[PDB]
Design an enzyme around this catalytic site. Structure first.
Site, PDB file in Angstrom:
ATOM      1  N   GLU A 148      34.943  24.838  60.458  1.00  0.00           N
ATOM      2  CA  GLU A 148      35.133  25.386  61.946  1.00  0.00           C
ATOM      3  C   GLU A 148      34.699  24.515  63.041  1.00  0.00           C
ATOM      4  N   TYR A 170      39.193   2.904  46.487  1.00  0.00           N
ATOM      5  CA  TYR A 170      38.717   3.891  46.284  1.00  0.00           C
ATOM      6  C   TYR A 170      38.781   4.281  44.827  1.00  0.00           C
ATOM      7  N   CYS A 213      44.480  11.043  39.042  1.00  0.00           N
ATOM      8  CA  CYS A 213      43.871  11.948  39.770  1.00  0.00           C
ATOM      9  C   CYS A 213      43.422  13.010  38.980  1.00  0.00           C
ATOM     10  N   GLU A 266      35.180   5.821  43.683  1.00  0.00           N
ATOM     11  CA  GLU A 266      35.322   7.059  42.867  1.00  0.00           C
ATOM     12  C   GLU A 266      34.551   6.979  41.493  1.00  0.00           C
ATOM     13  N   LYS A 326      40.213  12.023  36.785  1.00  0.00           N
ATOM     14  CA  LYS A 326      38.964  11.503  37.659  1.00  0.00           C
ATOM     15  C   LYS A 326      38.366  12.741  38.470  1.00  0.00           C
ATOM     16  N   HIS A 360      33.727  31.511  60.485  1.00  0.00           N
ATOM     17  CA  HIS A 360      32.274  31.442  60.383  1.00  0.00           C
ATOM     18  C   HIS A 360      31.689  32.096  59.126  1.00  0.00           C
ATOM     19  N   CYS A 414      48.735   9.437  37.082  1.00  0.00           N
ATOM     20  CA  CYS A 414      48.056  10.730  37.587  1.00  0.00           C
ATOM     21  C   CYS A 414      47.436  11.671  36.426  1.00  0.00           C
TER      22      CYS A 414
HETATM   23  C1  LIG Z   1      26.227  42.365  57.169  1.00  0.00           C
HETATM   24  C2  LIG Z   1      27.245  41.554  58.197  1.00  0.00           C
HETATM   25  C3  LIG Z   1      27.950  40.275  57.857  1.00  0.00           C
HETATM   26  C4  LIG Z   1      28.472  39.605  58.833  1.00  0.00           C
HETATM   27  N1  LIG Z   1      29.164  38.485  58.448  1.00  0.00           N
HETATM   28  C5  LIG Z   1      29.884  37.927  59.371  1.00  0.00           C
HETATM   29  C6  LIG Z   1      30.717  36.919  58.890  1.00  0.00           C
HETATM   30  O1  LIG Z   1      30.312  36.355  57.886  1.00  0.00           O
HETATM   31  N2  LIG Z   1      31.309  35.998  59.982  1.00  0.00           N
HETATM   32  C7  LIG Z   1      31.619  36.563  61.328  1.00  0.00           C
HETATM   33  O2  LIG Z   1      32.265  35.800  62.127  1.00  0.00           O
HETATM   34  N3  LIG Z   1      31.087  37.690  61.568  1.00  0.00           N
HETATM   35  C8  LIG Z   1      30.204  38.177  60.698  1.00  0.00           C
HETATM   36  N4  LIG Z   1      29.620  39.905  61.229  1.00  0.00           N
HETATM   37  C9  LIG Z   1      29.753  39.998  62.348  1.00  0.00           C
HETATM   38  C10 LIG Z   1      28.881  39.434  63.698  1.00  0.00           C
HETATM   39  O3  LIG Z   1      27.459  38.891  63.222  1.00  0.00           O
HETATM   40  C11 LIG Z   1      28.928  39.997  64.808  1.00  0.00           C
HETATM   41  O4  LIG Z   1      30.259  39.964  65.281  1.00  0.00           O
HETATM   42  C12 LIG Z   1      28.200  39.143  66.141  1.00  0.00           C
HETATM   43  O5  LIG Z   1      26.816  39.264  65.589  1.00  0.00           O
HETATM   44  C13 LIG Z   1      28.622  39.766  67.429  1.00  0.00           C
HETATM   45  O6  LIG Z   1      27.958  39.166  68.324  1.00  0.00           O
HETATM   46  P1  LIG Z   1      27.133  39.975  69.605  1.00  0.00           P
HETATM   47  O7  LIG Z   1      26.466  38.942  70.723  1.00  0.00           O
HETATM   48  O8  LIG Z   1      28.249  40.573  70.279  1.00  0.00           O
HETATM   49  O9  LIG Z   1      26.190  41.316  68.944  1.00  0.00           O
HETATM   50  P2  LIG Z   1      24.601  40.652  68.462  1.00  0.00           P
HETATM   51  O10 LIG Z   1      24.725  39.243  67.721  1.00  0.00           O
HETATM   52  O11 LIG Z   1      24.218  41.801  67.539  1.00  0.00           O
HETATM   53  O12 LIG Z   1      23.593  40.642  69.555  1.00  0.00           O
HETATM   54  C14 LIG Z   1      23.117  41.832  70.224  1.00  0.00           C
HETATM   55  C15 LIG Z   1      21.763  41.479  70.465  1.00  0.00           C
HETATM   56  O13 LIG Z   1      21.287  42.248  71.524  1.00  0.00           O
HETATM   57  C16 LIG Z   1      19.968  43.016  71.402  1.00  0.00           C
HETATM   58  N5  LIG Z   1      20.025  44.305  72.220  1.00  0.00           N
HETATM   59  C17 LIG Z   1      20.566  45.552  71.850  1.00  0.00           C
HETATM   60  N6  LIG Z   1      20.348  46.309  72.691  1.00  0.00           N
HETATM   61  C18 LIG Z   1      19.703  45.832  73.687  1.00  0.00           C
HETATM   62  C19 LIG Z   1      18.934  46.086  74.874  1.00  0.00           C
HETATM   63  N7  LIG Z   1      19.183  47.240  75.492  1.00  0.00           N
HETATM   64  N8  LIG Z   1      18.194  45.412  75.587  1.00  0.00           N
HETATM   65  C20 LIG Z   1      18.114  44.028  74.868  1.00  0.00           C
HETATM   66  N9  LIG Z   1      18.495  43.593  73.922  1.00  0.00           N
HETATM   67  C21 LIG Z   1      19.319  44.535  73.084  1.00  0.00           C
HETATM   68  C22 LIG Z   1      20.091  43.423  69.522  1.00  0.00           C
HETATM   69  O14 LIG Z   1      18.775  43.996  69.253  1.00  0.00           O
HETATM   70  C23 LIG Z   1      20.915  42.351  69.220  1.00  0.00           C
HETATM   71  O15 LIG Z   1      19.894  41.361  68.964  1.00  0.00           O
HETATM   72  C24 LIG Z   1      28.692  40.134  60.167  1.00  0.00           C
HETATM   73  C25 LIG Z   1      28.014  41.441  60.499  1.00  0.00           C
HETATM   74  C26 LIG Z   1      27.345  41.995  59.801  1.00  0.00           C
HETATM   75  C27 LIG Z   1      26.583  43.341  60.121  1.00  0.00           C
HETATM   76  C1  LIG Z   2      42.269   5.839  39.073  1.00  0.00           C
HETATM   77  C2  LIG Z   2      43.553   6.332  39.955  1.00  0.00           C
HETATM   78  C3  LIG Z   2      43.299   7.586  40.688  1.00  0.00           C
HETATM   79  C4  LIG Z   2      44.180   8.222  41.456  1.00  0.00           C
HETATM   80  N1  LIG Z   2      43.896   9.218  42.066  1.00  0.00           N
HETATM   81  C5  LIG Z   2      44.851   9.865  42.915  1.00  0.00           C
HETATM   82  C6  LIG Z   2      44.588  11.141  43.439  1.00  0.00           C
HETATM   83  O1  LIG Z   2      43.640  11.569  43.335  1.00  0.00           O
HETATM   84  N2  LIG Z   2      45.546  11.599  44.384  1.00  0.00           N
HETATM   85  C7  LIG Z   2      47.167  10.888  44.320  1.00  0.00           C
HETATM   86  O2  LIG Z   2      47.733  11.504  45.230  1.00  0.00           O
HETATM   87  N3  LIG Z   2      47.163   9.785  43.682  1.00  0.00           N
HETATM   88  C8  LIG Z   2      46.275   9.206  42.847  1.00  0.00           C
HETATM   89  N4  LIG Z   2      46.392   7.954  42.324  1.00  0.00           N
HETATM   90  C9  LIG Z   2      47.785   7.414  42.438  1.00  0.00           C
HETATM   91  C10 LIG Z   2      48.890   8.088  41.616  1.00  0.00           C
HETATM   92  O3  LIG Z   2      48.299   8.092  40.428  1.00  0.00           O
HETATM   93  C11 LIG Z   2      50.062   7.589  41.773  1.00  0.00           C
HETATM   94  O4  LIG Z   2      50.405   7.605  43.226  1.00  0.00           O
HETATM   95  C12 LIG Z   2      51.360   8.243  40.880  1.00  0.00           C
HETATM   96  O5  LIG Z   2      50.821   8.441  39.924  1.00  0.00           O
HETATM   97  C13 LIG Z   2      52.523   7.252  41.262  1.00  0.00           C
HETATM   98  O6  LIG Z   2      53.768   8.152  40.703  1.00  0.00           O
HETATM   99  P1  LIG Z   2      54.998   7.478  40.137  1.00  0.00           P
HETATM  100  O7  LIG Z   2      55.924   8.410  39.598  1.00  0.00           O
HETATM  101  O8  LIG Z   2      55.429   6.354  41.360  1.00  0.00           O
HETATM  102  O9  LIG Z   2      54.325   6.334  38.710  1.00  0.00           O
HETATM  103  P2  LIG Z   2      53.691   6.690  37.436  1.00  0.00           P
HETATM  104  O10 LIG Z   2      52.779   8.148  37.539  1.00  0.00           O
HETATM  105  O11 LIG Z   2      52.711   5.774  36.898  1.00  0.00           O
HETATM  106  O12 LIG Z   2      54.857   6.859  36.290  1.00  0.00           O
HETATM  107  C14 LIG Z   2      55.468   5.671  35.948  1.00  0.00           C
HETATM  108  C15 LIG Z   2      55.912   5.810  34.403  1.00  0.00           C
HETATM  109  O13 LIG Z   2      56.798   4.664  34.068  1.00  0.00           O
HETATM  110  C16 LIG Z   2      56.552   4.301  32.969  1.00  0.00           C
HETATM  111  N5  LIG Z   2      57.366   2.959  32.689  1.00  0.00           N
HETATM  112  C17 LIG Z   2      57.004   1.797  33.263  1.00  0.00           C
HETATM  113  N6  LIG Z   2      57.869   1.040  32.830  1.00  0.00           N
HETATM  114  C18 LIG Z   2      58.630   1.513  32.248  1.00  0.00           C
HETATM  115  C19 LIG Z   2      59.886   1.183  31.268  1.00  0.00           C
HETATM  116  N7  LIG Z   2      60.240  -0.137  31.471  1.00  0.00           N
HETATM  117  N8  LIG Z   2      60.433   2.117  30.534  1.00  0.00           N
HETATM  118  C20 LIG Z   2      60.259   3.444  30.534  1.00  0.00           C
HETATM  119  N9  LIG Z   2      58.955   3.859  31.291  1.00  0.00           N
HETATM  120  C21 LIG Z   2      58.391   2.881  31.861  1.00  0.00           C
HETATM  121  C22 LIG Z   2      55.145   4.336  32.764  1.00  0.00           C
HETATM  122  O14 LIG Z   2      54.251   3.997  31.528  1.00  0.00           O
HETATM  123  C23 LIG Z   2      54.658   5.711  33.731  1.00  0.00           C
HETATM  124  O15 LIG Z   2      54.228   6.671  32.755  1.00  0.00           O
HETATM  125  C24 LIG Z   2      45.578   7.316  41.447  1.00  0.00           C
HETATM  126  C25 LIG Z   2      45.725   6.265  40.815  1.00  0.00           C
HETATM  127  C26 LIG Z   2      44.650   5.806  40.027  1.00  0.00           C
HETATM  128  C27 LIG Z   2      45.055   4.454  39.417  1.00  0.00           C
END
Ligand SMILES: Cc1cc2nc3c(=O)[nH]c(=O)nc-3n(C[C@H](O)[C@H](O)[C@H](O)COP(=O)(O)OP(=O)(O)OC[C@H]3O[C@@H](n4cnc5c(N)ncnc54)[C@H](O)[C@@H]3O)c2cc1C
Ligand SMILES: Cc1cc2nc3c(=O)[nH]c(=O)nc-3n(C[C@H](O)[C@H](O)[C@H](O)COP(=O)(O)OP(=O)(O)OC[C@H]3O[C@@H](n4cnc5c(N)ncnc54)[C@H](O)[C@@H]3O)c2cc1C
Ligand SMILES: COc1ccc(NC(=O)CN)cc1
Lengths: 587, 586
Positions: free
Chosen positions: B569, B291, B154, B295, B157, B564, B149
């Protein structure tokens, strides 16, 4: 038990059919409604536990024990033969459409929770209207349907995060072998703003198409609830009128606050304006320390802004404070400047140049907590000091909907207000987390309980978050301080560890700045009380663990699960250094 | 019941103390043991539910009932006062190095599983030696301590995958506002390899330092088990000697296979050579469909290579096949060519240019399954047609270690082979998922059972995976066809949906990313398999592996709220079934 339920279901549903999957006399009646294009809820009695008891308890309305039975708005319509007679005699359309009010459901608010409730209700035959109206910001900014997340919250801010992340990708590309030179590349704000806005426009339009294809009436009007069943609407010519509805859902959300100081409303801006700003903000001062302030300060610096954040006391009040601080140390080390323990007291030196598309110039005066005086010039000033509702706009105090001391609607655990036909969802629901997926779940689940017989409630506990600061911060559960305060220091164990993403090794990035921890309760099988991780892709990392936390995961559960290699997340499956042991957590 | 655990713990442990967190006589002995720098296991009897019953069983060994009790390789050393006598008399240092063998433990194999066992065993006093040797590949490629690995798997690559991904990050930047022009940008293979190789070198060094600091003997030599306790070692000067150990762990891994056709060994390479190659492969043919093949073909295309993959029958045999097809469709739509239902029958046209640093030139001939002929030129031919062990190279046939038909070791559920002091871990343990974190966990947990009395077994069920193709594929649990085969189509419900990352909207595809949940109607709609194709599929999947482990249902996914905006999600709102016939697009 079952009698309380069936009463309220039949009274509340608009059109509801008690059926059985097997009975072909129910299939005959299903197809007639489908042909007539009459939407309805169905309740298959053979697929329920007290299914047999309901059939006998249904005879109290209908005087028959048999399936099918069709109800319309609390009234028995008939069995299979009676429904078919109405169909043959062109009487069935008149029966389903006849109602005490104009709509079964009126939704005030076309945002996240509000549109979600509307579509779902319309799937069971409820006749639904969705009202939306965006009151302009103090400089005139306005936007379309879909709410705060869609137009000026999660969606635009994250795209601007991503433009900011891409800068480190061009930094990194050289070390991985690409021939670009990041030094000679600049950023165009107006180009990015046009793409963000072109996508926001596709969602506004998609929401109108959705509402139309569910047969939902969409009125771009301001709504006011004047009585339990009466909503007064003012359209875009200021034509006033009144509609009536059976159930009422308030989903009007919040809007940004300004501090009560001279110049703020006149010369500053909030997030509501930031996401369609026609000109690069330039040298910017962000006032506040919430996740909106840090997030917005974060991408401006990454697009080459000269950014300063003014902090009253602490960052991310109400989040785990160890993590909050690590988030801020990362920002201070990577370009953001902080004026700490400081508040504002805003003068205009140059007006915004609207023709040439250049910011103005402003003078900010304030003072630090000890006594010293703040004074500096900035081209743009953003306020991020919290949001609030103004229900006085939405709700007449004579209706009798109870609000709390913050201005938010006091509900029961099933979203019911103090007026039995009025419910509130989303940000205006008091005490609930203010997140867009919470609003969507609440609205969807309430629609089912009102029109489809459902009884499931929304679970508000242990909802996970992510702060999309330049280095992200995901969380699910209690902060370390909250757990300790609730159970006692000697009952909490904490497993933590630094880590380094494999994508950072060739890029020569920092060794011991990503971090994670598990807060656990010893006397309860070492139950995981909160999960925390600072690193890249924190939302994708955190989300899967929210299911396990929901299920009551223990440290042993994380232990016996095997990791996926190579990933950041897998570091959660091998934690072992404790805080009490004193051992360092570094790579 | 309890008696058979204690008899086996006291016989394998090297130095063990029986203790009570309360006792100050136990504290006195503890303080002496690491003043002398004697590592040992400790068993705190007042934290085991049957600590009473165990204390009574100890007397069968010691003739006493109290704590502390200290043993060394199965012999009782003394109570509190007897050990303290041995201390002030300078006798205790020589008690603890009393052994019938040179080492408490010998690990053959210095990779993922072998290093993990060795460090952990040394933590409880076990005198440990780790053996590692890297046979050269046909062209002579060789590398350092850490296994497959770290050196040719792993680690390198995924770094190269990250280089492939940055290409699309460059394209995306224009759309988000940056001033660059992607068409005027190219890649430097050797710059990349130097960076990868620098990191690998710092891993080799860190593993050597880690072994030194745990007091573990690292012999860079090739080991061969000639009797249950005798290991024959051959060093870099071809000097032969023999060392003895009490316990033996085999952890020697696997190596790439070659097809038995003319020119394959002479003119082709494998992954073993790819990650340190001085020259860009160039136009490349990749043979195989595992894979590794996909990959490797994937990032080569993203770095500007002209890539064809020759596929014998299907992609990713053994994984969910709907997902395999989608993985391949995306690759075919973004650069990679496929020669399907085709095998190779390799002639050399140019010798590798070792001076100017250039590939040679090759002529591949083969045939499709209908008889039609294949004939095309390539600069580099990579073989990725499986891996295998060669235990006739570690393990004299007379020792008595049974192997299965593919030459892997047949072990009990506690990694014990057929010779009772000899154990196997990692890729050579038959039937077990061949993955690095499985090797690591198997090694650490075995060390604890051998030298510290632990009883926890390694749980090999439902281990999640990620295939780091240009669009990634994470999975945990059963494939859809497998689920259907075990329980029947009528008891299986599948929820699925397409999705589009928010990062993709401004960069301009709509319905390529896909996820599904394979569920069981009769068992409360249990989640039997999770599948997701998209970006960061490994970060996405990992967290869900914990919930599956706990037995998650469709309703557990439903009651959890999403984060969100994220790709992940989308799992928390699935609702369209395959039965419904409804379209899963958005
Ligand atoms: C800058 C910012 C970033 C945010 N980022 C995230 C985020 O990444 N993830 C997350 O989960 N939440 C986020 N939030 C919070 C999320 O947007 C709010 O929790 C969500 O919009 C609330 O849903 P709501 O339906 O209760 O209100 P709103 O989506 O505000 O809906 C209320 C709507 O009713 C309208 N309205 C109001 N009064 C009246 C009325 N008297 N008559 C008719 N229409 C009216 C308004 O104009 C508005 O369009 C963020 C908030 C802000 C301010
Ligand atoms: C291209 C590629 C990509 C991979 N990508 C992933 C990945 O993203 N995620 C993942 O979970 N797995 C991945 N794997 C699998 C991962 O490499 C193996 O599951 C893991 O390395 C196995 O570990 P091990 O201890 O069993 O053997 P190894 O890690 O291979 O170690 C065995 C060691 O024993 C040594 N050895 C052998 N014979 C002797 C001996 N007689 N005397 C002394 N030493 C000896 C070898 O030289 C070696 O160093 C990938 C494999 C390959 C080929
Ligand atoms: C033996 O360790 C290695 C050291 C360097 C390389 N190659 C390069 O740095 C440029 N091809 C490969 C392997």
């Amino acid at each position: 038990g079952t009698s309380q339920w069936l009463r309220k279901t039949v009274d509340s549903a608009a059109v509801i059919l008690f059926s059985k999957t097997t009975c072909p006399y129910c299939k005959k009646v299903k197809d007639v409604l489908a042909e007539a294009k009459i939407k309805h809820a169905t309740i298959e009695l053979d697929q329920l536990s007290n299914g047999s008891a309901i059939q006998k308890c249904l005879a109290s309305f209908s005087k028959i024990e048999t399936v099918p039975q069709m109800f319309v708005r609390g009234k028995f319509i008939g069995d299979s033969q009676t429904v078919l007679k109405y169909y043959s005699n062109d009487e069935l359309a008149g029966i389903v459409n006849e109602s005490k009010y104009d709509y079964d459901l009126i939704v005030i608010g076309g945002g996240s929770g509000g549109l979600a409730a509307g579509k779902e209700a319309a799937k069971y035959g409820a006749k639904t209207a969705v009202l939306d109206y965006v009151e302009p910001t103090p400089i005139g900014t306005t936007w379309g349907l879909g709410g705060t997340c869609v137009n000026v919250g999660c969606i635009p801010k994250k795209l601007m995060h991503q433009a900011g992340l891409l800068s480190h990708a061009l930094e990194d590309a050289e070390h991985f072998g690409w021939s670009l030179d990041r030094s000679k590349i600049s950023h165009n704000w107006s180009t990015m703003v046009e793409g963000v806005q072109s996508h926001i426009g596709s969602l506004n339009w998609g929401y109108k198409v959705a509402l139309r294809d569910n047969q939902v009436t969409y009125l771009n009007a301001k709504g006011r609830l004047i009585s339990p069943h009466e909503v007064q609407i003012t359209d875009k010519n200021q034509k006033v009128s009144t509609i009536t509805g059976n159930k009422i859902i308030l989903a009007t959300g919040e809007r940004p606050k300004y501090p009560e100081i001279p110049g703020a409303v006149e010369y500053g801006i909030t997030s509501d304006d930031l996401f369609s700003l026609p000109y690069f903000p330039g040298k910017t001062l962000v006032i506040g320390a919430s996740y909106v302030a840090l997030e917005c300060a974060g991408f401006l610096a990454s697009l080459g802004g000269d950014v300063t954040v003014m902090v009253r006391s602490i960052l991310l009040r109400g989040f785990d404070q160890q993590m909050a601080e690590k988030v801020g140390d990362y920002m201070e080390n990577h370009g953001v400047k902080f004026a700490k323990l400081c508040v504002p007291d805003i003068k205009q030196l140059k007006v915004v140049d609207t023709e040439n598309n250049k910011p103005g110039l402003l003078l900010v005066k304030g003072h630090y907590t000890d006594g010293k005086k703040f004074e500096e010039e900035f081209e743009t000033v953003i306020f991020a000091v919290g949001r609030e509702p103004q229900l006085s706009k939405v709700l007449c105090e004579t209706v009798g909907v109870k609000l709390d001391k913050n201005g938010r609607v006091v509900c029961t655990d099933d979203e019911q207000t103090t007026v039995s036909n009025v419910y509130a969802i989303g940000d205006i629901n008091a005490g609930k987390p203010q997140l867009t997926p919470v609003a969507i779940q609440a609205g969807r689940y309430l629609a089912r309980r009102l029109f489809a017989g459902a009884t499931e409630l929304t679970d508000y506990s242990n909802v996970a978050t992510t702060v999309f600061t330049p280095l992200e911060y995901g969380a699910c559960g209690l902060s370390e301080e909250d757990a300790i305060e609730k159970y006692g220091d000697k009952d909490i164990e904490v497993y933590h560890s630094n880590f380094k993403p494999l994508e950072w090794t060739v890029a020569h990035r920092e060794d011991n700045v990503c971090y994670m921890k598990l807060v656990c309760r010893k006397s309860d099988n070492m139950r995981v009380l909160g999960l925390h991780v600072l690193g890249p892709n924190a939302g994708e990392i955190t989300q899967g663990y929210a299911v396990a936390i929901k299920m009551g995961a223990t440290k042993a559960d994380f232990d016996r699960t095997i990791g996926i290699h190579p990933t950041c997340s897998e570091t959660f499956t091998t934690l072992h250094v404790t805080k009490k042991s004193g051992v360092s957590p570094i790579v």
